[PDB]
Amino acid sequence: AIVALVVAIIIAIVVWSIV
Incomplete structure (x- = not known):
């Protein structure tokens, strides 16, 4: 993932x- 998804x-x- 949610983190990488949130950033991107x-x-x-x-x-x-x-x-």
Whole structure:
């Protein structure tokens, strides 16, 4: 895993916000 998923997922979402 959830950790690696949270990071990869979290970032993926972020990049979308910025962007």
